[PDB]
Amino acid sequence: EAEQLKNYFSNPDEFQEEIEDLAQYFYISTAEIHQLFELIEALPTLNYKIDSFNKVKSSDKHISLLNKSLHKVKHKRLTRDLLKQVATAGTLVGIWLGDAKSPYPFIFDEIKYVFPSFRRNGDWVCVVDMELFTKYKDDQRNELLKSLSPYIKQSDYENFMKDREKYRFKELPQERTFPLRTGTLKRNQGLGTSWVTPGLYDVNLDTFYKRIGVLMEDIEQEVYQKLFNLVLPAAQKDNYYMNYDKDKPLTLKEKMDILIKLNDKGWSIKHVVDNLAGVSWESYLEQTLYETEELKLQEK
Amino acid sequence: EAEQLKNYFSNPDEFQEEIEDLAQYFYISTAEIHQLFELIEALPTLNYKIDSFNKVKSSDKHISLLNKSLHKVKHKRLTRDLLKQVATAGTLVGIWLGDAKSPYPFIFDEIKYVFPSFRRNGDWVCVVDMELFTKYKDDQRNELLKSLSPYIKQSDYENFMKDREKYRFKELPQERTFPLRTGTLKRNQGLGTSWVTPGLYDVNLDTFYKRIGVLMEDIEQEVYQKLFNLVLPAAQKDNYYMNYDKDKPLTLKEKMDILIKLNDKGWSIKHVVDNLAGVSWESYLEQTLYETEELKLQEK
Amino acid sequence: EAEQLKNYFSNPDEFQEEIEDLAQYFYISTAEIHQLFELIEALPTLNYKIDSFNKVKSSDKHISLLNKSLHKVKHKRLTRDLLKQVATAGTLVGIWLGDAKSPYPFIFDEIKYVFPSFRRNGDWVCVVDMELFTKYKDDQRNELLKSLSPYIKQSDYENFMKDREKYRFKELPQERTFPLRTGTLKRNQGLGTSWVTPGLYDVNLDTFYKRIGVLMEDIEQEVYQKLFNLVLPAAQKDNYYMNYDKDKPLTLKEKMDILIKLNDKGWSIKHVVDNLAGVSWESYLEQTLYETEELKLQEK
Amino acid sequence: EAEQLKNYFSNPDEFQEEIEDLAQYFYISTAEIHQLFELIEALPTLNYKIDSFNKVKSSDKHISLLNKSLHKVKHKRLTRDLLKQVATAGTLVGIWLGDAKSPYPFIFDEIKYVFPSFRRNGDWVCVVDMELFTKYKDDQRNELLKSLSPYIKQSDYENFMKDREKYRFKELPQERTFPLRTGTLKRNQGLGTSWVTPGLYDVNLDTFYKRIGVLMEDIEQEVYQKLFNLVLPAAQKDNYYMNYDKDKPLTLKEKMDILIKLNDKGWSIKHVVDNLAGVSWESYLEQTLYETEELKLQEK
């Protein structure tokens, strides 16, 4: 029994299959790990902000475009899934597939065949192994290869079959792919580790907030930065950047005080009436105009 | 005994029937799970806000229309049912059936025959298996098929009977169907899991708030966004979006303070006297007018 | 012994008679369930509001009419009875019998013969079985059938007797009937369950408030919405809606502070003097006028 | 021993005699039930207010008339007796006997012969059984029948004796009789239950306040509403309504602050001096006038 765990810990970058199996098994057959993973996926409030390294003339247009493109992708769910999966396996390789104007994400599931391998220019490089395709159905294989058409093609698989030991690995574009990792001490370590390994043999809140803050920063600077680059013109590359909040936010009372303080002489009133439970904005304005325009209460 | 639970946990995506049976059984035969599900259905306040990514000239009309369309569907009950059900099974497939102007929802019961299967363009695709219809009564089968007339038709069932291994699956529209899921680690995992599995072998409040907040976000961006798209014209597609509140709201005292502060010199008084127990608005205004107009108390 | 409870929990939608019998028995023979049900009936304060999706020209008339029609039905007692009964059985079917102008409610007792059965247009449909009438006395049966004259008639019972297996079920109008249910996980589940089932084998306050809040919302949007539709003209259908308060209200001190703050320069004084123990309003005004008009104390 | 209690709980609507006997016995032979009943009769502060659904021209006259008619009946004692008796038996049937101008109440003591039986128009109907009169003395029987002259008459008893199985039940006018009940889960249940049944086998404060609040509301809308209708003209039927307070009132300090705040420039001074211990109002005014008029202290 013990020897199995010892061997698994001997090579955390090779015995990944068993680690994932036990992780998924104890996710449902135990509560501690279940609470761990739902805490990972839940604790973040995912309030975000996009800022710039320069103030261009037409900035507001870029801000609106970035907000819209962040909604279209529906980021919050993607961030939560990425956090849960990286915590599960310790490493992950995604990519933006759709066209530049309206990109859509794609998350590889098998790490044994797609992973980061080395670095160049200080940035990771991820190589897809073509052996992955030996198991997918012919129709499914053709569909997938059509999915990555401009980057990978059926010709690549045919060449691989021609010489399995020559074209066994293919590089992915830097501007799209993103590898995420966690649990690596060395900056030159490829495969991370899963958070289940420590407590596996057994079968604070601000500490976890700070632990997930680094993952949020990594997702900001690896995933959504490339999206901003894709959506915006070439001139505005790396000019804008997105940040998530890692600390506990200020509650409703202080927010309401700040908003009501702001309103005085000009600033928006809608968001003032907005945070009040009930008291819908349109009902508020309609009844107010009825009372001030029709009845003329203030004259009586 | 133990082997049965071990096997159930081995394949959470195949042994769903027994999991649902045990979930429903312990809902009534025990209090812990009953409290769990009542807490899921009860804790949310379901105070909501629809906002826009742009300020159109006729915005107020859209806001009023969306509020009305949210009431007609009577959303709160639907949201509570969806939460309880997805927690029960871990996955759910609904669809907007009625016409675009006045849609009405429909929730499938058998996950084994209707489920999400894969993704395209980054979005889930749900395929209805026609074997489902092999058990319904002929009259009931015809009625149900007439229910989904434009999307599914009796001709599809006839073709399925002609070749059971060719037309065994049918796709549903993206603008209408919505799959919801919970308990999936990998972004490419279809079937979630039920919250009963962890504590099954056995037979904080802010943590649950945050756990259910993600469910509210998912239901916002999956269910009601499509409704907004249906109700509003094409030009305003995905322009508006609705958000539910996940944190504990500010109590009545602060609400009253903000409202009375707002009233000064112009803003509505109806919502001021409204929150006072008793003291109905009409009685208040009527007696005030009686005292100031007829008796002229302030002149004496 | 245990087998009986196991069988009862096996089919909560079939063994309802025994469940209700045990519920009523332990209501009086034990204090826990008695406290439970008295808490359901007592905790709500039943302060209510009526608001509109539009501000019509003659709104005040509609507000007054709705308040009067809410009093005539004497809603509070009806709401408490409905809550207690639905908690007792888990389901309930009522209807508005009297004419539209001054309707009066009617609550069926036998769920086994009157229940919701299926859905159409997203709304439940309740079917009355005619076998119910096989037990009532001929005079009583005729009286009851006269009660539901426009919707059900003696001709229906005669047809049922002609062919017991053809006219066995009858539909009720949507604008009048209302089914209420509780304890159902699946949105397509007809019969709820009683709150006694969990603790039956054995023989927080804000949690109960929130649990009863959902029932209050259900009664608001299912029971009294139809009443509002009946009383108001066709043009104002679904325009007005009623809401009960679910949280703990602000105490008397803050209420009096708000009222006195309001009174300044014009607003009603009657409710200010009203909430003071003793100090009847008419005595207050009469003595004030006596002192300021005859004695002229302020001149001495 | 146990079988007797089990049988009593089997038919709470039939074994009422023994329940009342044990209730009255343990009222004096035990302290718990004694505290229960004195708490019921004592806790309410019976501060009341009459409000209107409309503001008629001569409202003040109606307010004064209603206050006077509430004092003449000496409501507080009647309310306390009604609460104690309904708690004792679970049901009660009263009626207004005297003429409309100055009505006086009458509370039947036997429930086995006078009770509510069914409903019509949504309102309970109470039927007096004439068997009740078989025990009263001939002189006493004639006196009682003269008491209810316009409603019941000796002719009714003679007809009953003529055919005991035909005229065995007589209806009472709706505008006068009032049935009160408690302990009924079903809206179609006639006989309530006594509060002694739960703890009988054995031999918070805000919870009891809320429990008695519903009884106070029932007494308001069943007993005194009919009185208001009787006293006021036909045009003002159901226009006015009376409400008792169920929460703990604001203490003397806040009341005094509110009154002294009100007094400024015109409002009554008598109630200001009134709540001060000692310092009788007439002594206060007399000594004040002596000091300001005779001695002229303020000039010295």
CSV table of N, CA and C in Angstrom, one decimal, chain B residues 24-25 27-31 34-35 37-39 41-43 45 67-68 71 74 76-78 80-81 84-85 88 104-109 209 252-253 256 260 269-282 284-285 287-288 291 295 297-298 300, chain C residues 6 9-10 12 47 49-51 53 60 63-64 67 119 121-123 181 183-188 193-195 197-198 207 210-211 214 217-218 221 225 238-239 241 246-250 254-255 258-259 261-263 265-271 281 285 289 293:
chain,number,residue,atom,x,y,z
B,24,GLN,N,-33.5,11.3,-3.6
B,24,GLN,CA,-34.9,11.5,-3.3
B,24,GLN,C,-35.3,10.7,-2.1
B,25,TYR,N,-34.8,9.5,-1.8
B,25,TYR,CA,-35.2,8.8,-0.6
B,25,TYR,C,-34.7,9.5,0.6
B,27,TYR,N,-33.9,12.6,1.0
B,27,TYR,CA,-34.6,13.9,1.1
B,27,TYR,C,-35.7,13.8,2.2
B,28,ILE,N,-36.5,12.7,2.1
B,28,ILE,CA,-37.6,12.6,3.0
B,28,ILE,C,-37.3,11.7,4.3
B,29,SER,N,-36.4,10.8,4.1
B,29,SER,CA,-36.1,9.9,5.2
B,29,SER,C,-35.1,10.4,6.2
B,30,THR,N,-34.5,11.6,5.9
B,30,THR,CA,-33.5,12.2,6.8
B,30,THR,C,-33.7,13.7,6.7
B,31,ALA,N,-33.2,14.4,7.8
B,31,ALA,CA,-33.3,15.9,7.9
B,31,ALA,C,-32.1,16.6,7.3
B,34,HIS,N,-32.6,17.2,3.7
B,34,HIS,CA,-33.7,18.1,3.5
B,34,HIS,C,-33.4,19.5,3.8
B,35,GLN,N,-32.6,19.7,4.9
B,35,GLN,CA,-32.1,21.1,5.2
B,35,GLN,C,-31.2,21.6,4.1
B,37,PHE,N,-31.3,21.0,0.8
B,37,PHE,CA,-32.0,21.4,-0.3
B,37,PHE,C,-32.9,22.6,0.0
B,38,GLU,N,-33.6,22.6,1.1
B,38,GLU,CA,-34.4,23.8,1.5
B,38,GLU,C,-33.5,25.0,1.6
B,39,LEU,N,-32.2,24.8,2.1
B,39,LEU,CA,-31.3,26.0,2.1
B,39,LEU,C,-31.0,26.5,0.8
B,41,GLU,N,-32.8,26.2,-1.9
B,41,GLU,CA,-34.0,26.9,-2.5
B,41,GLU,C,-34.4,28.2,-1.8
B,42,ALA,N,-34.0,28.3,-0.5
B,42,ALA,CA,-34.5,29.4,0.3
B,42,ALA,C,-33.5,30.6,0.4
B,43,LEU,N,-32.2,30.3,0.7
B,43,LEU,CA,-31.2,31.3,1.0
B,43,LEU,C,-31.2,32.4,-0.1
B,45,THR,N,-32.0,35.6,-2.2
B,45,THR,CA,-32.9,36.6,-2.2
B,45,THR,C,-33.5,36.9,-3.6
B,67,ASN,N,-38.6,43.8,-17.5
B,67,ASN,CA,-39.2,43.6,-16.2
B,67,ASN,C,-40.5,42.8,-16.4
B,68,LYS,N,-41.3,43.3,-17.3
B,68,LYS,CA,-42.6,42.6,-17.5
B,68,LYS,C,-42.4,41.2,-17.9
B,71,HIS,N,-41.5,39.0,-15.1
B,71,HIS,CA,-42.6,38.7,-14.2
B,71,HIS,C,-43.6,37.7,-14.8
B,74,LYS,N,-42.6,34.6,-14.2
B,74,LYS,CA,-42.5,34.3,-12.8
B,74,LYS,C,-41.2,33.7,-12.4
B,76,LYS,N,-38.7,33.8,-10.2
B,76,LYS,CA,-38.2,33.3,-8.9
B,76,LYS,C,-38.5,31.9,-8.7
B,77,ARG,N,-39.7,31.4,-8.9
B,77,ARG,CA,-40.0,30.0,-8.8
B,77,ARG,C,-39.2,29.1,-9.7
B,78,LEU,N,-39.1,29.6,-11.0
B,78,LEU,CA,-38.3,28.8,-11.9
B,78,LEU,C,-36.8,28.7,-11.5
B,80,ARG,N,-35.6,28.8,-8.4
B,80,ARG,CA,-35.5,28.0,-7.3
B,80,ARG,C,-35.7,26.5,-7.7
B,81,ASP,N,-36.6,26.2,-8.6
B,81,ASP,CA,-36.7,24.8,-9.1
B,81,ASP,C,-35.5,24.4,-9.8
B,84,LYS,N,-32.7,23.6,-7.2
B,84,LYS,CA,-33.0,22.4,-6.4
B,84,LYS,C,-32.7,21.2,-7.3
B,85,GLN,N,-33.2,21.2,-8.6
B,85,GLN,CA,-33.1,20.1,-9.5
B,85,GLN,C,-31.7,19.8,-9.9
B,88,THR,N,-30.0,18.3,-7.3
B,88,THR,CA,-30.4,16.9,-7.2
B,88,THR,C,-29.7,16.0,-8.1
B,104,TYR,N,-42.3,30.3,-23.0
B,104,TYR,CA,-42.5,29.5,-21.8
B,104,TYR,C,-41.5,28.4,-21.7
B,105,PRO,N,-41.1,28.1,-20.5
B,105,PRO,CA,-40.0,27.1,-20.4
B,105,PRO,C,-40.5,25.7,-20.4
B,106,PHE,N,-39.5,24.7,-20.6
B,106,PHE,CA,-39.8,23.3,-20.6
B,106,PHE,C,-38.5,22.6,-20.1
B,107,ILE,N,-38.7,21.8,-19.1
B,107,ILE,CA,-37.6,21.1,-18.4
B,107,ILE,C,-37.7,19.6,-18.7
B,108,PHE,N,-36.8,19.0,-19.4
B,108,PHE,CA,-36.8,17.5,-19.6
B,108,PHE,C,-36.5,16.8,-18.2
B,109,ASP,N,-37.0,15.6,-18.1
B,109,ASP,CA,-36.8,14.8,-16.9
B,109,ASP,C,-35.7,13.8,-17.0
B,209,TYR,N,-23.5,30.6,0.6
B,209,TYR,CA,-23.9,31.7,-0.2
B,209,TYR,C,-23.0,31.8,-1.5
B,252,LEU,N,-33.3,46.9,6.7
B,252,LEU,CA,-34.3,47.9,6.4
B,252,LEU,C,-33.9,49.2,6.9
B,253,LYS,N,-33.1,49.3,8.0
B,253,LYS,CA,-32.7,50.6,8.6
B,253,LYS,C,-31.9,51.4,7.6
B,256,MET,N,-34.0,52.5,4.6
B,256,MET,CA,-34.9,53.7,4.9
B,256,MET,C,-34.1,54.9,5.0
B,260,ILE,N,-35.0,58.1,2.6
B,260,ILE,CA,-35.4,59.4,3.2
B,260,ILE,C,-34.4,60.5,2.8
B,269,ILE,N,-41.9,60.0,-2.8
B,269,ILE,CA,-42.3,59.8,-1.4
B,269,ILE,C,-43.0,58.5,-1.2
B,270,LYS,N,-43.6,57.9,-2.3
B,270,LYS,CA,-44.3,56.7,-2.2
B,270,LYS,C,-43.5,55.5,-1.6
B,271,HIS,N,-42.3,55.3,-2.1
B,271,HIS,CA,-41.4,54.3,-1.6
B,271,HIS,C,-40.9,54.6,-0.2
B,272,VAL,N,-41.0,55.9,0.3
B,272,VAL,CA,-40.7,56.2,1.6
B,272,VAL,C,-41.7,55.7,2.6
B,273,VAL,N,-42.9,56.1,2.5
B,273,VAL,CA,-44.0,55.6,3.4
B,273,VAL,C,-44.3,54.1,3.2
B,274,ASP,N,-43.8,53.6,2.0
B,274,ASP,CA,-44.1,52.2,1.7
B,274,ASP,C,-43.6,51.2,2.7
B,275,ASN,N,-42.3,51.4,3.1
B,275,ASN,CA,-41.6,50.4,3.9
B,275,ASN,C,-42.0,50.5,5.4
B,276,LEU,N,-42.8,51.5,5.8
B,276,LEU,CA,-43.3,51.6,7.1
B,276,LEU,C,-44.4,50.6,7.3
B,277,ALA,N,-44.3,49.8,8.4
B,277,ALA,CA,-45.4,48.8,8.7
B,277,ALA,C,-46.7,49.6,8.9
B,278,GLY,N,-47.8,49.1,8.3
B,278,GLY,CA,-49.0,49.9,8.4
B,278,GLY,C,-48.7,51.1,7.6
B,279,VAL,N,-49.6,52.1,7.9
B,279,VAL,CA,-49.4,53.5,7.3
B,279,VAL,C,-49.4,53.4,5.8
B,280,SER,N,-50.4,52.7,5.2
B,280,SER,CA,-50.5,52.5,3.8
B,280,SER,C,-50.4,53.9,3.1
B,281,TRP,N,-49.8,53.8,1.9
B,281,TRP,CA,-49.5,55.1,1.2
B,281,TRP,C,-50.8,55.9,0.9
B,282,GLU,N,-51.9,55.2,0.5
B,282,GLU,CA,-53.1,55.9,0.1
B,282,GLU,C,-53.7,56.5,1.4
B,284,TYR,N,-52.0,57.4,4.1
B,284,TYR,CA,-51.2,58.5,4.4
B,284,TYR,C,-51.5,59.8,3.6
B,285,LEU,N,-51.5,59.7,2.3
B,285,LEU,CA,-51.7,60.8,1.5
B,285,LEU,C,-53.1,61.4,1.7
B,287,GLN,N,-55.1,61.2,4.4
B,287,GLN,CA,-55.3,61.9,5.7
B,287,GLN,C,-54.4,63.2,5.7
B,288,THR,N,-53.3,63.2,5.0
B,288,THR,CA,-52.4,64.4,5.0
B,288,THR,C,-53.2,65.5,4.2
B,291,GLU,N,-56.0,66.9,6.4
B,291,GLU,CA,-55.6,67.8,7.5
B,291,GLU,C,-55.1,69.1,6.9
B,295,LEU,N,-59.2,71.0,7.3
B,295,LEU,CA,-59.1,71.6,8.6
B,295,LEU,C,-58.2,72.8,8.6
B,297,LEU,N,-55.0,72.7,9.8
B,297,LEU,CA,-54.3,72.6,11.1
B,297,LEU,C,-53.2,73.6,11.2
B,298,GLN,N,-52.3,73.7,10.1
B,298,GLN,CA,-51.1,74.5,10.2
B,298,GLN,C,-51.5,76.0,10.3
B,300,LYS,N,-53.7,76.9,12.6
B,300,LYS,CA,-54.2,77.0,14.0
B,300,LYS,C,-53.2,76.4,14.9
C,6,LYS,N,-40.5,2.8,5.9
C,6,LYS,CA,-39.7,2.6,4.6
C,6,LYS,C,-40.6,2.6,3.4
C,9,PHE,N,-42.1,6.1,2.8
C,9,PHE,CA,-41.1,7.0,2.1
C,9,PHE,C,-40.8,6.5,0.7
C,10,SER,N,-41.1,5.2,0.4
C,10,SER,CA,-40.9,4.8,-1.0
C,10,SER,C,-41.7,5.5,-2.0
C,12,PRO,N,-44.0,8.6,-1.6
C,12,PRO,CA,-44.6,9.8,-1.0
C,12,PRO,C,-45.8,10.3,-1.7
C,47,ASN,N,-47.4,42.1,6.6
C,47,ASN,CA,-47.4,43.4,6.0
C,47,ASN,C,-47.2,43.3,4.5
C,49,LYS,N,-47.5,45.0,0.2
C,49,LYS,CA,-47.4,46.1,-0.7
C,49,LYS,C,-48.0,45.7,-2.0
C,50,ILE,N,-48.5,46.7,-2.7
C,50,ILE,CA,-49.0,46.5,-4.1
C,50,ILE,C,-48.3,47.5,-5.0
C,51,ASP,N,-47.7,47.1,-6.0
C,51,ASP,CA,-47.0,47.9,-6.9
C,51,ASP,C,-47.4,47.6,-8.4
C,53,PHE,N,-46.5,47.7,-12.8
C,53,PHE,CA,-45.5,47.7,-13.9
C,53,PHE,C,-45.7,49.0,-14.8
C,60,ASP,N,-54.5,55.6,-8.3
C,60,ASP,CA,-54.9,55.7,-6.9
C,60,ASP,C,-56.2,54.9,-6.7
C,63,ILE,N,-55.4,51.3,-6.5
C,63,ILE,CA,-54.8,51.0,-5.2
C,63,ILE,C,-55.8,50.8,-4.1
C,64,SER,N,-56.7,51.8,-4.1
C,64,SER,CA,-57.8,51.7,-3.1
C,64,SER,C,-58.7,50.5,-3.3
C,67,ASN,N,-56.8,47.4,-2.1
C,67,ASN,CA,-56.8,47.3,-0.6
C,67,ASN,C,-58.1,46.8,-0.1
C,119,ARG,N,-48.7,20.0,-17.2
C,119,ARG,CA,-48.5,21.4,-17.5
C,119,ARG,C,-48.8,21.7,-18.9
C,121,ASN,N,-48.5,25.4,-21.6
C,121,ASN,CA,-48.1,26.8,-21.7
C,121,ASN,C,-47.2,27.1,-20.5
C,122,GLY,N,-46.6,26.1,-19.8
C,122,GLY,CA,-45.7,26.4,-18.7
C,122,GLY,C,-46.5,26.4,-17.4
C,123,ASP,N,-47.8,26.3,-17.4
C,123,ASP,CA,-48.6,26.5,-16.1
C,123,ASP,C,-49.3,25.1,-15.8
C,181,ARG,N,-47.8,23.8,-3.9
C,181,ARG,CA,-47.0,22.6,-3.6
C,181,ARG,C,-45.7,23.0,-3.0
C,183,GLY,N,-42.0,20.8,-1.3
C,183,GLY,CA,-41.3,19.6,-1.1
C,183,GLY,C,-40.9,18.8,-2.3
C,184,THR,N,-41.2,19.4,-3.5
C,184,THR,CA,-40.8,18.8,-4.8
C,184,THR,C,-39.5,19.3,-5.3
C,185,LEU,N,-38.6,18.3,-5.6
C,185,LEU,CA,-37.3,18.6,-6.2
C,185,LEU,C,-37.4,18.9,-7.7
C,186,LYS,N,-38.1,18.0,-8.4
C,186,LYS,CA,-38.2,18.1,-9.9
C,186,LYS,C,-39.3,19.0,-10.3
C,187,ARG,N,-39.1,20.0,-11.2
C,187,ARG,CA,-40.1,20.9,-11.6
C,187,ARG,C,-41.3,20.2,-12.2
C,188,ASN,N,-41.1,19.0,-12.7
C,188,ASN,CA,-42.2,18.2,-13.3
C,188,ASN,C,-42.7,17.1,-12.3
C,193,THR,N,-44.6,17.0,-0.5
C,193,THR,CA,-44.5,16.2,0.7
C,193,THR,C,-44.7,17.0,1.9
C,194,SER,N,-45.0,16.4,3.0
C,194,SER,CA,-45.3,17.1,4.3
C,194,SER,C,-44.0,17.2,5.1
C,195,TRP,N,-43.9,18.3,5.8
C,195,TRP,CA,-42.7,18.5,6.6
C,195,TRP,C,-42.5,17.6,7.8
C,197,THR,N,-42.5,14.2,7.5
C,197,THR,CA,-41.9,13.0,7.1
C,197,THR,C,-40.5,12.9,7.7
C,198,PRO,N,-39.6,13.9,7.6
C,198,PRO,CA,-38.2,13.7,8.1
C,198,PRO,C,-38.1,13.3,9.6
C,207,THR,N,-33.5,31.0,9.2
C,207,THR,CA,-33.7,29.9,8.2
C,207,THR,C,-35.2,29.6,8.0
C,210,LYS,N,-36.8,32.4,6.0
C,210,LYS,CA,-36.5,32.3,4.6
C,210,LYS,C,-37.3,31.1,4.0
C,211,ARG,N,-37.4,30.0,4.7
C,211,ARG,CA,-38.2,28.9,4.2
C,211,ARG,C,-39.7,29.3,3.9
C,214,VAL,N,-40.5,31.8,0.7
C,214,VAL,CA,-40.8,31.2,-0.7
C,214,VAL,C,-42.3,30.9,-0.8
C,217,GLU,N,-44.1,34.1,-1.4
C,217,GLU,CA,-44.0,34.5,-2.8
C,217,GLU,C,-44.9,33.6,-3.6
C,218,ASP,N,-44.9,32.3,-3.4
C,218,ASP,CA,-45.8,31.5,-4.2
C,218,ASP,C,-47.3,31.9,-4.0
C,221,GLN,N,-47.9,35.2,-6.0
C,221,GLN,CA,-47.9,35.2,-7.5
C,221,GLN,C,-48.9,34.2,-8.0
C,225,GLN,N,-52.6,37.2,-7.3
C,225,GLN,CA,-52.5,37.8,-8.6
C,225,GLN,C,-53.8,37.5,-9.4
C,238,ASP,N,-52.6,41.9,-14.9
C,238,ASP,CA,-51.3,41.6,-14.6
C,238,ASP,C,-50.5,42.9,-14.4
C,239,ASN,N,-51.1,44.1,-14.4
C,239,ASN,CA,-50.4,45.3,-14.2
C,239,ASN,C,-49.9,45.5,-12.8
C,241,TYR,N,-49.3,44.0,-8.8
C,241,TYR,CA,-48.9,42.8,-8.1
C,241,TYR,C,-48.6,43.1,-6.7
C,246,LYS,N,-40.7,39.4,4.1
C,246,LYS,CA,-40.2,38.1,4.5
C,246,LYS,C,-39.1,38.3,5.7
C,247,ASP,N,-38.6,39.5,5.8
C,247,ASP,CA,-37.6,39.7,6.9
C,247,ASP,C,-38.2,40.3,8.1
C,248,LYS,N,-37.4,40.4,9.2
C,248,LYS,CA,-37.8,41.0,10.4
C,248,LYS,C,-38.0,42.5,10.2
C,249,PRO,N,-39.1,43.1,10.6
C,249,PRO,CA,-39.3,44.5,10.3
C,249,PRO,C,-38.6,45.4,11.3
C,250,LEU,N,-38.4,46.7,10.9
C,250,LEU,CA,-37.8,47.7,11.8
C,250,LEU,C,-38.8,48.0,12.9
C,254,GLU,N,-37.6,53.3,15.4
C,254,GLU,CA,-37.2,53.8,14.1
C,254,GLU,C,-38.4,54.3,13.3
C,255,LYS,N,-39.5,53.5,13.3
C,255,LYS,CA,-40.7,53.9,12.6
C,255,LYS,C,-41.2,55.2,13.1
C,258,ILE,N,-38.9,58.0,11.8
C,258,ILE,CA,-39.2,58.3,10.4
C,258,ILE,C,-40.4,59.1,10.2
C,259,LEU,N,-41.5,58.7,10.9
C,259,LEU,CA,-42.8,59.5,10.8
C,259,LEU,C,-42.7,60.9,11.3
C,261,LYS,N,-39.9,62.7,11.5
C,261,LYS,CA,-39.1,63.4,10.5
C,261,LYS,C,-40.0,63.8,9.3
C,262,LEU,N,-40.9,62.9,8.9
C,262,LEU,CA,-41.7,63.2,7.7
C,262,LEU,C,-42.7,64.4,8.0
C,263,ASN,N,-43.2,64.4,9.2
C,263,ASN,CA,-44.3,65.3,9.5
C,263,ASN,C,-44.0,66.8,9.1
C,265,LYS,N,-43.7,70.3,8.2
C,265,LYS,CA,-44.3,71.1,7.2
C,265,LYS,C,-45.1,70.3,6.2
C,266,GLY,N,-46.2,69.8,6.7
C,266,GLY,CA,-47.3,69.3,5.8
C,266,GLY,C,-47.7,67.9,6.0
C,267,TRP,N,-46.8,67.0,6.2
C,267,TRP,CA,-47.1,65.6,6.2
C,267,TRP,C,-47.9,65.2,7.4
C,268,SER,N,-48.7,64.1,7.3
C,268,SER,CA,-49.8,63.8,8.2
C,268,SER,C,-49.3,63.7,9.6
C,269,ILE,N,-50.1,64.3,10.5
C,269,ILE,CA,-49.8,64.2,12.0
C,269,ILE,C,-50.5,63.0,12.6
C,270,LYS,N,-51.6,62.5,12.0
C,270,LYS,CA,-52.4,61.5,12.6
C,270,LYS,C,-51.6,60.2,13.0
C,271,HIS,N,-50.8,59.8,12.0
C,271,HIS,CA,-50.1,58.5,12.3
C,271,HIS,C,-48.9,58.8,13.3
C,281,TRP,N,-56.0,59.8,19.2
C,281,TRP,CA,-55.8,60.9,18.3
C,281,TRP,C,-56.9,62.0,18.5
C,285,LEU,N,-56.2,65.9,19.5
C,285,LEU,CA,-56.5,67.1,18.8
C,285,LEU,C,-57.6,67.9,19.5
C,289,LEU,N,-56.9,71.8,20.6
C,289,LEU,CA,-57.8,72.9,20.2
C,289,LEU,C,-58.4,73.6,21.4
C,293,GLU,N,-57.5,77.5,21.7
C,293,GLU,CA,-58.6,78.3,21.2
C,293,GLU,C,-59.4,79.1,22.3
